[PDB]
Amino acid sequence: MREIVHIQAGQCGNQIGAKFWEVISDEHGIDPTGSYHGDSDLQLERINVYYNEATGNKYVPRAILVDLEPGTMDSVRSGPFGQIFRPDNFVFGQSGAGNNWAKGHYTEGAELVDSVLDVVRKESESCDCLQGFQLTHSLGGGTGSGMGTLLISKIREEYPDRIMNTFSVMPSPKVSDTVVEPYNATLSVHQLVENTDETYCIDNEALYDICFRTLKLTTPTYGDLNHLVSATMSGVTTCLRFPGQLNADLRKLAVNMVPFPRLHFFMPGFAPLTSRGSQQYRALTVPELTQQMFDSKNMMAACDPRHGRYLTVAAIFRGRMSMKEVDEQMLNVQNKNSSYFVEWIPNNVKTAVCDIPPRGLKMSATFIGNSTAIQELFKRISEQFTAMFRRKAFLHWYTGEGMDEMEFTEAESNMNDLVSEYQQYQDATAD
Amino acid sequence: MREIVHIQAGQCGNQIGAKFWEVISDEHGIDPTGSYHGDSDLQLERINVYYNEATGNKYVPRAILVDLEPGTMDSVRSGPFGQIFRPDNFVFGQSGAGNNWAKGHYTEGAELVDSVLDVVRKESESCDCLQGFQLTHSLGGGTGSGMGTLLISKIREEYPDRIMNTFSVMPSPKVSDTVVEPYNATLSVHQLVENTDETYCIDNEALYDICFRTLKLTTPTYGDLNHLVSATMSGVTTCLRFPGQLNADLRKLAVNMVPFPRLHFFMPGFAPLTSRGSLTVPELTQQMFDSKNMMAACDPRHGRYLTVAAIFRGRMSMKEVDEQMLNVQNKNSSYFVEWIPNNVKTAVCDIPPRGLKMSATFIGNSTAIQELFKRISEQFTAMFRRKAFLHWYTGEGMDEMEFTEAESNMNDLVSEYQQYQDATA
Amino acid sequence: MEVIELNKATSGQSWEVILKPPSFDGVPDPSLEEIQKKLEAAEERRKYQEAELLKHLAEKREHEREVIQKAIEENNNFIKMAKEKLAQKMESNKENREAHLAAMLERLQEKDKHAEEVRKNKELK
Amino acid sequence: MRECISIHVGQAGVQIGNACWELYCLEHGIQPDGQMPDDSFNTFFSETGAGKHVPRAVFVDLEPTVIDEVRTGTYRQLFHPEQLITGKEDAANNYARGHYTIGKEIIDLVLDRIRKLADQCTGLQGFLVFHSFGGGTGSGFTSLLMERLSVDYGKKSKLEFSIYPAPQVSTAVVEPYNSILTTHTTLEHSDCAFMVDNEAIYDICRRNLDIERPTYTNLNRLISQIVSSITASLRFDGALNVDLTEFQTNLVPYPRIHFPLATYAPVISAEKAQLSVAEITNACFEPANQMVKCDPRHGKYMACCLLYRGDVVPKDVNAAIATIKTKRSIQFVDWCPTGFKVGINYQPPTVVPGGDLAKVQRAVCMLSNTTAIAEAWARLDHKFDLMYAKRAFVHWYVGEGMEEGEFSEAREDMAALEKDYEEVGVD
Amino acid sequence: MRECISIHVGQAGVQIGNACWELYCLEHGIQPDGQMPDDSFNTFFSETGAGKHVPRAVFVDLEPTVIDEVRTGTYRQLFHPEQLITGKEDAANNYARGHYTIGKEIIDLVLDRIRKLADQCTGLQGFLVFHSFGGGTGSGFTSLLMERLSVDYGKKSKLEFSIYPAPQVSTAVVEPYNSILTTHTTLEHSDCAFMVDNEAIYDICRRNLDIERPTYTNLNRLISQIVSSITASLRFDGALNVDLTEFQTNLVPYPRIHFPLATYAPVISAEKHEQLSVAEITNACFEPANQMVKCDPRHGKYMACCLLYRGDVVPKDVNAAIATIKTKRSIQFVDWCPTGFKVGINYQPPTVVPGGDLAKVQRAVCMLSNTTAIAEAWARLDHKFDLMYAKRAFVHWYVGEGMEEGEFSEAREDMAALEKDYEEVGV
Ligand SMILES: Nc1nc2c(ncn2[C@@H]2O[C@H](COP(=O)(O)OP(=O)(O)OP(=O)(O)O)[C@@H](O)[C@H]2O)c(=O)[nH]1
Ligand SMILES: Nc1nc2c(ncn2[C@@H]2O[C@H](COP(=O)(O)OP(=O)(O)OP(=O)(O)O)[C@@H](O)[C@H]2O)c(=O)[nH]1
Numbered sequence A: 001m002r003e004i005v006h007i008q009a010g011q012c013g014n015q016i017g018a019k020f021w022e023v024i025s026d027e028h029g030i031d032p033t034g035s036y037h038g039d040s041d042l043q044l045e046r047i048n049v050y051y052n053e054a055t056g057n058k059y060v061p062r063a064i065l066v067d068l069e070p071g072t073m074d075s076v077r078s079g080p081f082g083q084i085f086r087p088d089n090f091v092f093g094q095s096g097a098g099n100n101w102a103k104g105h106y107t108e109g110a111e112l113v114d115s116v117l118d119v120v121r122k123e124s125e126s127c128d129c130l131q132g133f134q135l136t137h138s139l140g141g142g143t144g145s146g147m148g149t150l151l152i153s154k155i156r157e158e159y160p161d162r163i164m165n166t167f168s169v170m171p172s173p174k175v176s177d178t179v180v181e182p183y184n185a186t187l188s189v190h191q192l193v194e195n196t197d198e199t200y201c202i203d204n205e206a207l208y209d210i211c212f213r214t215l216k217l218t219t220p221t222y223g224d225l226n227h228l229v230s231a232t233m234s235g236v237t238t239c240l241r242f243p244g245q246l247n248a249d250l251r252k253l254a255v256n257m258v259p260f261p262r263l264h265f266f267m268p269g270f271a272p273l274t275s276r277g278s279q280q281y282r283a284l285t286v287p288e289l290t291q292q293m294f295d296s297k298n299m300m301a302a303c304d305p306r307h308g309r310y311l312t313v314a315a316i317f318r319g320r321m322s323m324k325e326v327d328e329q330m331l332n333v334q335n336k337n338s339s340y341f342v343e344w345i346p347n348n349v350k351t352a353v354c355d356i357p358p359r360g361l362k363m364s365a366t367f368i369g370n371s372t373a374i375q376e377l378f379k380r381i382s383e384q385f386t387a388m389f390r391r392k393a394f395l396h397w398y399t400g401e402g403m404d405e406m407e408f409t410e411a412e413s414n415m416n417d418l419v420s421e422y423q424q425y426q427d428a429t430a431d
Numbered sequence B: 001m002r003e004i005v006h007i008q009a010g011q012c013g014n015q016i017g018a019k020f021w022e023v024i025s026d027e028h029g030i031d032p033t034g035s036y037h038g039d040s041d042l043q044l045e046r047i048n049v050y051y052n053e054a055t056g057n058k059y060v061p062r063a064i065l066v067d068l069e070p071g072t073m074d075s076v077r078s079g080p081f082g083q084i085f086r087p088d089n090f091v092f093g094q095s096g097a098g099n100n101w102a103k104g105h106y107t108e109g110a111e112l113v114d115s116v117l118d119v120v121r122k123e124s125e126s127c128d129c130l131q132g133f134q135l136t137h138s139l140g141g142g143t144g145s146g147m148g149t150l151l152i153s154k155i156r157e158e159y160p161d162r163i164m165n166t167f168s169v170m171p172s173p174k175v176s177d178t179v180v181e182p183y184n185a186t187l188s189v190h191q192l193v194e195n196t197d198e199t200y201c202i203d204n205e206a207l208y209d210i211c212f213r214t215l216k217l218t219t220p221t222y223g224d225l226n227h228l229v230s231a232t233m234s235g236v237t238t239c240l241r242f243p244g245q246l247n248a249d250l251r252k253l254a255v256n257m258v259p260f261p262r263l264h265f266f267m268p269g270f271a272p273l274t275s276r277g278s279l280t281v282p283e284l285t286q287q288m289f290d291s292k293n294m295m296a297a298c299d300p301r302h303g304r305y306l307t308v309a310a311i312f313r314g315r316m317s318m319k320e321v322d323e324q325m326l327n328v329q330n331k332n333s334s335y336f337v338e339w340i341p342n343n344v345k346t347a348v349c350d351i352p353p354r355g356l357k358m359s360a361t362f363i364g365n366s367t368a369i370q371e372l373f374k375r376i377s378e379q380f381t382a383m384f385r386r387k388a389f390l391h392w393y394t395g396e397g398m399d400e401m402e403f404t405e406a407e408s409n410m411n412d413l414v415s416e417y418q419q420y421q422d423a424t425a
Numbered sequence C: 001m002e003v004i005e006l007n008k009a010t011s012g013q014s015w016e017v018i019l020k021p022p023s024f025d026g027v028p029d030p031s032l033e034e035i036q037k038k039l040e041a042a043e044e045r046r047k048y049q050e051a052e053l054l055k056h057l058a059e060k061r062e063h064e065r066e067v068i069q070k071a072i073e074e075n076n077n078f079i080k081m082a083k084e085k086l087a088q089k090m091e092s093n094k095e096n097r098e099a100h101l102a103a104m105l106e107r108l109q110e111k112d113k114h115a116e117e118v119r120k121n122k123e124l125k
Numbered sequence D: 001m002r003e004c005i006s007i008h009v010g011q012a013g014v015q016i017g018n019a020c021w022e023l024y025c026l027e028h029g030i031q032p033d034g035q036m037p038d039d040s041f042n043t044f045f046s047e048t049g050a051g052k053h054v055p056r057a058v059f060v061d062l063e064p065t066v067i068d069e070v071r072t073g074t075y076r077q078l079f080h081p082e083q084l085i086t087g088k089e090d091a092a093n094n095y096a097r098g099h100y101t102i103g104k105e106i107i108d109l110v111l112d113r114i115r116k117l118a119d120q121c122t123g124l125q126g127f128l129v130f131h132s133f134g135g136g137t138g139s140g141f142t143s144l145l146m147e148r149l150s151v152d153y154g155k156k157s158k159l160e161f162s163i164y165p166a167p168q169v170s171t172a173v174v175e176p177y178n179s180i181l182t183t184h185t186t187l188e189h190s191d192c193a194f195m196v197d198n199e200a201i202y203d204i205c206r207r208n209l210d211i212e213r214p215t216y217t218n219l220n221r222l223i224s225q226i227v228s229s230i231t232a233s234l235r236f237d238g239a240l241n242v243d244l245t246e247f248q249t250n251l252v253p254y255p256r257i258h259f260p261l262a263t264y265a266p267v268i269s270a271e272k273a274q275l276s277v278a279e280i281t282n283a284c285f286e287p288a289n290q291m292v293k294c295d296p297r298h299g300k301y302m303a304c305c306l307l308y309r310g311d312v313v314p315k316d317v318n319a320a321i322a323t324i325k326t327k328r329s330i331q332f333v334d335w336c337p338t339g340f341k342v343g344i345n346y347q348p349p350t351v352v353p354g355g356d357l358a359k360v361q362r363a364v365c366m367l368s369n370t371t372a373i374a375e376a377w378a379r380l381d382h383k384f385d386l387m388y389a390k391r392a393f394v395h396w397y398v399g400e401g402m403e404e405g406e407f408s409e410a411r412e413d414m415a416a417l418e419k420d421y422e423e424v425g426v427d
Numbered sequence E: 001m002r003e004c005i006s007i008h009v010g011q012a013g014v015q016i017g018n019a020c021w022e023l024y025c026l027e028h029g030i031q032p033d034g035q036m037p038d039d040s041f042n043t044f045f046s047e048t049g050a051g052k053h054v055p056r057a058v059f060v061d062l063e064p065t066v067i068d069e070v071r072t073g074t075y076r077q078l079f080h081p082e083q084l085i086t087g088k089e090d091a092a093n094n095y096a097r098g099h100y101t102i103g104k105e106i107i108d109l110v111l112d113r114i115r116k117l118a119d120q121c122t123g124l125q126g127f128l129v130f131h132s133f134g135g136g137t138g139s140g141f142t143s144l145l146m147e148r149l150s151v152d153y154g155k156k157s158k159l160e161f162s163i164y165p166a167p168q169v170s171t172a173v174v175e176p177y178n179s180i181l182t183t184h185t186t187l188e189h190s191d192c193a194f195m196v197d198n199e200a201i202y203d204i205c206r207r208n209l210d211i212e213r214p215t216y217t218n219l220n221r222l223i224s225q226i227v228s229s230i231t232a233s234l235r236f237d238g239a240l241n242v243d244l245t246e247f248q249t250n251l252v253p254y255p256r257i258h259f260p261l262a263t264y265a266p267v268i269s270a271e272k273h274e275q276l277s278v279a280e281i282t283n284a285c286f287e288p289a290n291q292m293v294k295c296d297p298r299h300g301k302y303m304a305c306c307l308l309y310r311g312d313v314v315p316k317d318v319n320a321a322i323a324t325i326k327t328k329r330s331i332q333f334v335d336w337c338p339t340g341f342k343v344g345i346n347y348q349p350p351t352v353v354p355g356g357d358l359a360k361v362q363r364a365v366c367m368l369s370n371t372t373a374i375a376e377a378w379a380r381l382d383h384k385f386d387l388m389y390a391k392r393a394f395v396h397w398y399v400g401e402g403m404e405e406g407e408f409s410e411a412r413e414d415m416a417a418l419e420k421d422y423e424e425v426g427v
């Protein structure tokens, strides 16, 4: 279990994926040309998880960049670290999907996906011990959501014994005005329930609320939002990328975090919350990190964890701090807040500490929760879906590409089934 | 009726056997190199009963040393008299008996037993007239107990007309080595009932009680118990080893001591009792019929003597010895069966045991020995009724019936002792 | 008394002293073969006894063999039952794991057929 | 003659083997290249023609990380490379993958290596198997290994040292499942299993050694002392030795009832500024010094094996044990007339320099079979029941080919095992 | 010539033989080397071509220790090797072992040696057989031998000197068995048997000789004097009992009642000297303290009575001694027999072993009488036999040698018949 193959699809997928690669390259001392320039060997111990060694002392991200829209990979190559990616791993169509899931999933996306599998197989067969795949995408658009889920299915067909992980950006009317985003999200969640092992729910609604309410940004941009996404992605992959006592990998994570196969949608949290590019004038304490981490203002999904119960929790602290103090804060948070942890999964909170903090922070903490409160996210989507589907608003966008109402009905049904089983386990007793 | 062949088996067998050779070599003036250096010809008149006379005017014990474990015989070899033994008379296996009678009797013992019989068979052919065998062993362990009784059986098959004599050490929870001693001992008592002619019952329970109550030894050790065993083994062999007008041998002893074939278990006694490192004829006579002096944990006043053989060592009036032995028989008349006239025989030998100037040794065939076997039977029954530890024996091929038959036989022995206790004229 | 001379010899003499005459006038085998028969008969009883003893010890020898043999049969039966159990659960697990993977790839393939129906329905419009 | 082969499975088993074989080398004067300036250590070390002494041991793990540290660490020349066996993917904390999916790819190799080790023994006593209950390899591969050992070697003795999981020490959430599954599968195949509770070892390192946050190396070094006490009888010329057969005979009254309780004393901080035979003997019946958290005053003893090492005289053991027989708080079952076995090896305990344990002139390891150990089983079974009632995480086991029937069949065996401990404690 | 052959069987018979042949040699002037400076002594000694005088004797003992005395003794040159018959293994105090197991082994060898002696005789009278009642050899082999002597020497007299057991003297617990078994088998084959009660002889030595604990030598020295008195008119030219036939003529009116009582006086201490009169020693013949079997002649009737005087004894004095006791004492003979005595004087003086404990006396006497009182000795033996045989104590040792249990009861019935016969004639 070492190599991960990263895939980024659509505008959102490629924007957050690029940011992810800038952020971890800086953590590992890799500059935009692929040369290592860091000071500590621990930057390189597990560097193969995300990077191939190209001869010439260089490191190339194991990353495949996909979009039906050609322009978004022109903007990747022009961003900082555009030059770090393998040029042949850019796979671009010449027409976007018009925020239309059926275009991404059935028609134009399906005409490009074999082009994508070419690159995916080459990166995979090169691996000594392939862990699996992580995909960044949004659920509200046409390419990330439709072609991204299609891609998942195709890859699962060829690599069914490998872990399939996603970072999936949920739509919010606060951030985008595209009215069919509830449709695309609901069609995609149907696909993700059946075909991924772990999905990090990154909620644009939560990201906007954090930027507006906590960071005091009157008009937050995708830059402001993606700063929070990239802090999360760095935190939740920290254990994969540095050597710890845990022999952390994607399958051990899934085994211990997912008690029921469909219930694999995690609520990420992070502390401290910062604005992008901003000097931090005081570090947070271990009790501060521990408390602020289980606080609804720090969740990357617009859900109050106190409205449900945790099935499982994985937490990672970064920086120089007492592991003793970390253990006593974590245990105390579980005892005082005993009623937000299901009692029929004993010892369901796991803590790791990595001595290396992220850039700009002396100390930080990242939170991976499998909470039954995540049903609030799916209910919000499902309500928005129904208000449109009652009227059959915009359906001809989809039937024009070959779909049928029945596929909408089923996806709506499957997400309401998801809500119910979250609720079933929320109300379940140990007697 | 000259030579005895001596066999010591298992850890306990070899510890008390080595102590025995140590003691009698001192009595017959034999140093650890095998050279004689004594001061009297009385010591060499019957020395071939126990020693072969080597080429270079040397004496080699007629001893065969057996264990399934190399550790104990290693320790013997480095002991005080270790060098005196014929080096090729050490027969030792490699993988032990696991404190398990079934392993010593069936599996591991079988694989070693023919190596032992070859060495027994060589010592027997170098005898002008073979008297029989003496075996030292415990009953509570695996090797001396299971392999010892297997040896006895095979030796009976090959020499069915030679006397078989054992010094058999009884287990006691007061001095235990293994939790399965009740099983091991009960399975062996069965064998001895069937296959020995004379068994000296050496009761660790009695030895511990003697050391604690009489010798004031707060915490007895094997050294302390084995001091009592070697004094007893010296005592009960004195007549085989020194010339007495009785002309003592093992078959004559069995003839006059064993009225009924199964009732061949003797209560040994000894006076005076001594601690390691640190009396009159009337006392010797009494102290010797005293429960505090029996090497079996049995009160002889709880039954009746079928036959008694007594030996006094040291210079003393044989008139006074005969006087007092009669006095004791008359005063204690109800503890002797009336239907065996004159059932106490007294011998005297002039040579005292080392460090003592007067000693007495008692060999009783008492119906009170049933108390020894009842104690074993009760401990057996407490374990076997829950079938505790049974699987280490069935796993060796044993049937449960072997367990129930062996204790059925031991309770039959008890009943038979009881039947003669209550018989009258 | 009445003394009566009996004899006189070199190294002694004898006679008889009568004190009273009697009140009452007057006075009121195996062959060699037989012996050998009884000596031989006792020898054959000795020998019969010894033969019966050795016969019982022979019976114990064979029981010893049967005990050692039974333990070896138990060990072999332990091995055989262990072997068949393990192969049973290994093949059952293989069948299960292959059946799960085939169902998983069967569902994704129905999806593949359905995508062809979507693309056909489009050109039909 | 009288050889024992040690098998160390998964992370926990391999790291504990590191502490054990380090201690053995120090105990016998063996350098880390196998060279060496009483031959009983031959039961645990073969010897090459160059006078090199090679552990009779296999290290197995389905992932190479831990065993790679052996391959490049201090004792990298102590083992032959072929004795250090690694796959490429671990069992991901999943019994089903250790036992079937992943373990089946390497099991034939491991048995081939063990069979080559057995071929070097003239009187094999048995196998000692070190493993965790909670790991996917420690549970699932050990179960497979033990089954294949029964096929290859029949009833040849198999004894285990097993790490019982504790929330304090890093613990995966499905560890209760793996523990019950390996215990069900292994029960018929093991003759005697010495359980080690990570919480108990953890608490001792804190109370007795004043280590705030003990590490595995802290825990393993204490575990290695206890292990060394058990095997000392087999590795030295002792006064009173106790071979593997004697352990099984005196500690295991019924086949299923084969889980003895280990206690050890003294455990003294190396930074503290000699305890009598009586003192350290009484310490073995104090609940603070046990290797498994349970309360023997609330149970009944069925067997006590006391293993002394160092400067110990039998008159002192006899007096110490006689005191114990008078304590009313130490209750023995009705059907055990005699419950004490004693061994004394004269070489004092050894300690790794730079460790935390102090050098002492005498120490003792007690192995007791108490009905109180059932309290440890009940704790596991309750955690298993909490999750299993919702079938939490079961899909990861079924996905690898297991059937739910295997779960209930395993849990019913533990129920029957718990009722057995009740039964053997009655009068 | 009237030769007699002496046969000594078992330890008691051999050691008493030693005492007798030593005393005969002193009475006849035969030195220990066999040389010699009245020819009647030839009835007991042959002569070789070298001039050596050789006892007409065979010694049989299945244990080489006792006969090895003879071979290396003081009188060792008197005997030729073929007179000394040993084996390796004695009868272990077991009549059945002596009679059947070894009897069948050695009987032909023994009869062959006796036959070599008998071929040297021109007028063999018969045999004098010395043996214990109590030993396995003395009882068991003797009875087989007597059966064979009746076959091979039909018309020859057989006299026995039988040592009757005593608890004081070294005595096995089964001696009453062996005593009744050998009495039964031998009864039909002996003409006259002089019993020697070890208890009587022990009592005479303590009281008359002042010996606290008499040895076998003390007893055998005294028994030698009695045997000498009985055989003195065979070995010198006497006038009473001048051939063996005359013993049954003068003492045995009824063939089964062939057990005379011997009384002897005086026994005087060598340490301790008035010379006793003919009256005093004659008085001593009617004192039960001087009998060789303990019994009360007041409880019986005489059938026969011989006075055998030795030394300075004049007929005048004997008749006046006899006249004195007849007026003071009641001496009851049976009705059909005359009341009186046969009197012999042998002029040869009584001789003692120099340095022994018996003093040299001028005159002595032995009274041989056949009284019914001696059946009290049989009743003592029969009672001990009955006490043990009721429980079958020790019988398995006899049955193990091939004897049938029914021989015990057939022998005991014969003793019952013998007691009844003594009753009938002592009416
Ligand atoms: N957090 C975040 N969300 C984004 C970003 N870019 C787009 N989105 C969200 O993504 C959704 C629209 O999906 P897109 O990624 O733009 O669509 P696409 O995958 O490129 O598909 P097409 O443009 O129709 O070809 C809306 O909910 C947007 O709010 C971004 O950079 N960061
Ligand atoms: N005492 C002790 N316990 C350990 C050690 N390492 C792991 N454990 C315990 O073992 C259990 C985890 O199982 P591991 O042995 O690490 O897992 P594994 O056997 O390697 O199996 P996989 O990694 O799942 O393939 C947890 O209960 C740990 O606390 C150790 O070095 N010493």
Ligand SMILES: Nc1nc2c(ncn2[C@@H]2O[C@H](COP(=O)(O)OP(=O)(O)OP(=O)(O)O)[C@@H](O)[C@H]2O)c(=O)[nH]1
Pocket: E009, E010, E011, E012, E013, E015, E016, E061, E090, E091, E092, E093, E094, E098, E131, E132, E133, E134, E135, E136, E137, E138, E139, E163, E164, E165, E166, E169, E170, E171, E172, E175, E198, E216, E217, E219, E220, E223
């Ligand atoms: N008077 C006397 N009696 C003896 C003598 N030796 C043995 N006895 C008695 O003889 C009886 C024992 O029989 P033994 O003649 O010694 O034995 P054995 O006939 O040689 O037969 P085994 O049993 O085969 O030794 C006991 O009653 C002894 O007291 C002796 O020298 N003189």
Ligand SMILES: COc1cc(C(=O)c2cncc(-c3ccc(C)c(O)c3)n2)cc(OC)c1OC
Pocket: A236, A237, A238, A239, A240, A246, A247, A248, A249, A250, A252, A253, A256, A257, A312, A313, A314, A315, A316, A347, A348, A349, A350, A351, A352, A368, D171, D172, D173, D174
């Ligand atoms: C604990 O933090 C992490 C752990 C892992 C593991 O690989 C891993 C390994 N072993 C066990 C567990 C575990 C997880 C959760 C629970 C409730 C539990 O009981 C055990 N996780 C990976 C991570 O990032 C990908 C990570 O970062 C947040």
Ligand SMILES: COc1cc(C(=O)c2cncc(-c3ccc(C)c(O)c3)n2)cc(OC)c1OC
Pocket: B235, B236, B237, B238, B239, B240, B246, B247, B248, B249, B250, B252, B253, B256, B257, B307, B308, B309, B310, B311, B342, B343, B344, B345, B346, B347, B361, B363, E171, E172, E173, E174
């Ligand atoms: C008398 O003491 C002993 C005798 C013997 C005999 O060999 C022997 C020989 N002859 C007779 C008897 C005898 C024994 C018991 C009774 C009741 C009896 O009436 C006679 N024993 C051997 C001894 O040590 C082995 C011994 O030592 C105490």
Ligand SMILES: Nc1nc2c(ncn2[C@@H]2O[C@H](COP(=O)(O)OP(=O)(O)O)[C@@H](O)[C@H]2O)c(=O)[nH]1
Pocket: B009, B010, B011, B012, B013, B015, B016, B097, B099, B100, B138, B139, B140, B141, B142, B143, B144, B145, B169, B170, B171, B172, B175, B176, B177, B178, B181, B204, B207, B222, B225, B226, B229
């Ligand atoms: N008296 C005594 N008893 C011992 C000695 N050694 C062991 N025992 C007893 O022997 C029994 C154990 O059997 P042991 O001889 O050690 O086992 P083995 O080697 O398998 O025959 C227990 O009852 C111990 O008390 C010893 O030296 N003296």
Ligand SMILES: [Mg+2]
Pocket: A247, D010, D011, D063, D090, D135, D137
């Ligand atoms: Mg592992």
